[PDB]
Swiss-Prot record, chains A, B:
This is Two pore calcium channel protein 1. Changing residue 408 to N: In fou2; shows elevated LOX and AOS activity levels and an increased resistance to B.cinerea. Strongly increases oxylipin biogenesis in response to wounding. Residues 632-649 are annotated as: Disordered. The gene is TPC1. Belongs to the calcium channel alpha-1 subunit (TC 1.A.1.11) family. Two pore calcium channel subfamily. Residues 632-641 have a biased composition (Basic and acidic residues). It comes from Arabidopsis thaliana (Mouse-ear cress).
Amino acid sequence: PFQKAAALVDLAEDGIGLPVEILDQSSFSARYYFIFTRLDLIWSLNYFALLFLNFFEQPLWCEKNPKPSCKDRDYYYLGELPYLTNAESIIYEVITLAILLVHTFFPISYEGSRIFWTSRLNLVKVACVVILFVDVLVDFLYFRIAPYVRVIIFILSIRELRDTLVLLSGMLGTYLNILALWMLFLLFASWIAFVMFEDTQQGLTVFTSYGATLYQMFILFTTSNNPDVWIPAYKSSRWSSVFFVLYVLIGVYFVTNLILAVVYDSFKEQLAKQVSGMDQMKRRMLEKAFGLIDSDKNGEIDKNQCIKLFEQLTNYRTLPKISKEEFGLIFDELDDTRDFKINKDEFADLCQAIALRFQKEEVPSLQIYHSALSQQLRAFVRSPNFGYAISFILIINFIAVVVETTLDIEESSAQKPWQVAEFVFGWIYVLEMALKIYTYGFENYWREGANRFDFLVTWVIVIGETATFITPFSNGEWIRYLLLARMLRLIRLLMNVQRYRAFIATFITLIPSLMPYLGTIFCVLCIYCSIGVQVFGGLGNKKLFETELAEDDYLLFNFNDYPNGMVTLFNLLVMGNWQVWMESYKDLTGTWWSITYFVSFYVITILLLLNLVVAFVLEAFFTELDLEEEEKCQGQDSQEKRNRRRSAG
Amino acid sequence: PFQKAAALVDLAEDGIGLPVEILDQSSFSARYYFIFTRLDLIWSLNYFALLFLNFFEQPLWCEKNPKPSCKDRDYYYLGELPYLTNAESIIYEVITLAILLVHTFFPISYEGSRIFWTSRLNLVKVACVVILFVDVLVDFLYFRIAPYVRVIIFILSIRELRDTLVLLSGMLGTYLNILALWMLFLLFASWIAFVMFEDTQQGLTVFTSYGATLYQMFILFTTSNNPDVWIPAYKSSRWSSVFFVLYVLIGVYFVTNLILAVVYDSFKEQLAKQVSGMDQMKRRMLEKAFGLIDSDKNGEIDKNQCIKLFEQLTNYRTLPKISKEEFGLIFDELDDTRDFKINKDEFADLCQAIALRFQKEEVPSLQIYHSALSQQLRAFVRSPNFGYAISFILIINFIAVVVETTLDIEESSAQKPWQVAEFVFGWIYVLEMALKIYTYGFENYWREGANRFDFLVTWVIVIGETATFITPFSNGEWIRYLLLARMLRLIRLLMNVQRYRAFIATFITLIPSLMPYLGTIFCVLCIYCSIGVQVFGGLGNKKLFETELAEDDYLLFNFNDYPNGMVTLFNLLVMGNWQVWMESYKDLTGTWWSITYFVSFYVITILLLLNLVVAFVLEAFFTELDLEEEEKCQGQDSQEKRNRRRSAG
Ligand SMILES: COc1ccc([C@H]2N[C@H](C(=O)O)Cc3c2[nH]c2ccccc32)cc1CN1CCN(c2ccccc2F)CC1
Ligand SMILES: COc1ccc([C@H]2N[C@H](C(=O)O)Cc3c2[nH]c2ccccc32)cc1CN1CCN(c2ccccc2F)CC1
Ligand SMILES: CCCCCCCCCCCCCCCC(=O)O
Ligand SMILES: CCCCCCCCCCCCCCCC(=O)O
Ligand SMILES: [Ca+2]
Ligand SMILES: [Ca+2]
Ligand SMILES: [Ca+2]
Ligand SMILES: [Ca+2]
Ligand SMILES: [Ca+2]
Ligand SMILES: [Ca+2]
Ligand SMILES: [Ca+2]
Ligand SMILES: [Ca+2]
Ligand SMILES: [Ca+2]
Ligand SMILES: [Ca+2]
Ligand SMILES: [Ca+2]
Ligand SMILES: [Ca+2]
Ligand SMILES: [Ca+2]
Ligand SMILES: [Ca+2]
């Protein structure tokens, strides 16, 4: 099943779909080289599952500080998740590690042996593998850097995280220098403030002076402690504030902003680099296909040679036109010349143009079946009235749900009937899922993102129903009222309003695209939390806990547990009342060096990654602006002054 | 002193300097129409003083709540500034109002009577004047909206604030709609969270439910109360956090960012509008001058006609070249044609080109004096070695100062000698001021910004010396160690490092340019504070003060006084622990409507003006990037494909 022309057409569709591989030749459908990656996909879904669960091993992982004394699994030094036993832990560690290993050495399948070993990615991946396994054996017989290779093996296990990392690296160098200037602002400012308030009342806050005045000026840099840090000085003199305002201003509006400007520039650049490299890589496939078609090597393809290529592209991928004797006729009209030679570089541009205009990916097959009985249903499902029907069923679902919930707030028993109706609503959706997938096929249905999401939500509902009914309100209310979110697609309605089209459109294109960078910033938290659990086992818990933190101890109710540490790290990441974690923990250890963690976290994530995501969101929104602006034709683009099309048919 | 050609040349220099006036003709230097605005400048400096002091009347203004009972000018309901008496207040109110009035009706001088009255600006300005005066009389005989016209009269008293306001207005419309979408996010989110936690423990925080759950979700939108707001829920269930993270995320990284994106777009647009209009206005002057030169009206200027114009431009404004018989020769070389006709539109482009290249503003005169004795000094001052000498004197000043201060921190009496030396240092600077101004002239010296700043700082030092010595350490230490800032120009040194050139250059171009927008956001605070003093006279002060605020009462140590209210408003503007002011004051009045102030302040300044200043800083930095990039030639720009210069001489 490997037509000669056919190899080429499909490959064109790979260029447009943009799939990535780098194998220079497959000897005679798949052929020897393709079949490996070809069967890698099925393993790729399960692989997905394996890296997610493998990765979640760390939260359910049992803590290291509990293994010694004293009170075992008490609420003292508080925790909240299931934890895990090493007997129950190791079976899973070994399953994840074995399956993982299969996955890591599967590439040699489609790669040269010495090629797989020589590649830096495979050597590093396999290295983390080796560390993981050695530590799993050691663990079996009887634990410090075992999780780190969990998150590190995970970060490069998925490409989209990987290339995001790479994007960071390029802007990292410049980021460091700008950090140097920032640090000179902090040093100098701390100095002048401290010297200003040495013989004054704020000697108590400046008691440690520059070592501490630098600390306080640093937190004031965040504004997290704005009124509180200089309140003794302000009490001493109303004019003292004139400094801090002056200091806060410059710190926040002048410095902290153009920092972001730096990150915006570096990021924008690196993204240009990344998409351009992406373009060379896609063109690699395109030129590959063409080169296959061009047997003679002259660098051009005959009319008779390219006609077939259009035939299998038109039939196989996209709906363009119908070949004819008049085929030849069209060739005569364009130039009234008779060579019929299209270049290697020209053919690619042709195919991309076919992608934007002629392209529109036809269904794959799906049967050994008859079209009649289903055939009724199919045309009726694709009808617009059908979509109207689902719209109205979700509107009627919204009113239904509002009523059920409001009945819970009212507490009347009348909430029960409507709630059962909500379950019936759920069924409609499963039907919609089953019919829709039956009507378009699984591959098309999965092509659109909203349908993938819908599918998965629906299935959360179904498993919720089996569990809920086999298992026997709060048992059901909580589980099913949330999934009202499947009514969320109704928001695309607002795009019809001209004002809100850029906001909702940018938000919807933003929900997936922001995901690589959000995951990037999330792993950072995983590593940081592995660090935290190791370094802060306690909390002097009994005198030092109450002295360290009051209101904050209400906040410092966490960081002795990995989930605890994840949510606490979130609190730091949003930067709300963050310093209480920094100062309190500082005196739980007693050494200022502890604070480095927190100043290491700030710079890496608050001054780098979050600023980055700002740049990403603004850049995406602006792209949207230019797109909608382009749809109403303007900013006319040709090759320099004008294009040499020479008139149409 | 009004040469016919000369009127035109100088006007060209107005185009390049960009001064603004709109008078269509001055009948036969100044002439009838120019002389008015011409003598407006001297009055413009004093006017400056008058709007600043007039404006500062509000802080020194005596409060309205103290006028009734009870305890008069106690520390109870605390205050800290001088306040003012109505006998001492009214003399100044009337002086400011009279001088101001002279200023407001001075334009008819250069304007048509019905023209001045018809202009919207003059009618509004004069209207605020009339309100001010009426209230000053009423005040004399014996107070609510009198200050508002102080800040409003001030905002349009200076152009740069005015056009910034105008810039805001254009983006204001769109800003409102985006605010609508934001408000639907707040409403919907508050709903779903509240329904989620109605039958749960966080019923106490959700006790008032949507009225209050909307409030809490709103503050969580700011992250100002992140850990604290949902701590009871998190205590009830660790999984509760899964909501807030999900909520916080979307609120901060998705929504709050693209809000800024909106402000960035609207602002960038409005700035394009403003600078383009600026360009039409400048070209108005250019075309005016040319039209004057072109007596025949054909629309072009003869060689003999334009030669004179170049002669008085070269002599009067900038150093270009020397006219010759070969003058004619150059004309023959360009085109080997003999018409010598340059168009109205062409002449303008010519003049702008002369600005960038040939232009370089020669000293104005300054004498009835002899050049000999000063003439030594002058060439020596302009020498580069002289600047090196000041550089080294400021370096030696930095070490000197570090030593004095460190002696204060050490507390040794040895701090005294060095400190006296610092005073001698100050004198060097006054010399540098006096010599420099003598060597370049006051107008050139004032042309460069660093020299204006230096001048003023130096003078703070001199008045400090007269006051300090006539008046008799802390008396001197505080007053003179600060002015070490005149050593701050040493930072331009870092621009020599390639990395830091964009940061320091963007920061230095940013210090003045950010000033219009900072002033804009500052007046907002003046109005808001006039509102605050009126609406919050008390603080039930005695039970309600201690109940309302603890730590916060340490923060709610203010807002009963105008200066107090200004610094407190600053604390809100930086958004650090802001909600304590909102909630506490809310129960000092007891009505939720109070909170509107604080939600009115947030949206107007935190979601609009500050986001704006972000846009401004990033945009400025990017402009810098493109400028330095342009200096190393790239991105070659011509009129479309190529320019028709036709070769040089
Ligand atoms: C490296 O050790 C120094 C060099 C200079 C200073 C400043 N102290 C001087 C003083 O006592 O007055 C004035 C001055 C300083 N820095 C300046 C820069 C320019 C001009 C004046 C100064 C402080 C230090 C000590 N610092 C260095 C940084 N430290 C530190 C660094 C990383 C993590 C945690 C930390 F605590 C804390 C202690
Ligand atoms: C105008 O009065 C309303 C309309 C709708 C609601 C929400 N309450 C509903 C409920 O009780 O469950 C659900 C729901 C709401 N809003 C929605 C939007 C879409 C879908 C569901 C909802 C609340 C209110 C009352 N709100 C309106 C706004 N209020 C307010 C406005 C400005 C300043 C100060 C304020 F306190 C506070 C009280
Ligand atoms: C580079 C200049 C920065 C300084 C900014 C000026 C701030 C004004 C300082 C006034 C504080 C007076 C302190 C007196 C304390 C007291 O009276 O006990
Ligand atoms: C649109 C979906 C939003 C919902 C996000 C999911 C958050 C998980 C909710 C779990 C909270 C469980 C509350 C139980 C309280 C208790 O046990 O007393
Ligand atoms: Ca295939
Ligand atoms: Ca283990
Ligand atoms: Ca001391
Ligand atoms: Ca002192
Ligand atoms: Ca060929
Ligand atoms: Ca033709
Ligand atoms: Ca917490
Ligand atoms: Ca003049
Ligand atoms: Ca008054
Ligand atoms: Ca209730
Ligand atoms: Ca319930
Ligand atoms: Ca003429
Ligand atoms: Ca020539
Ligand atoms: Ca305060």
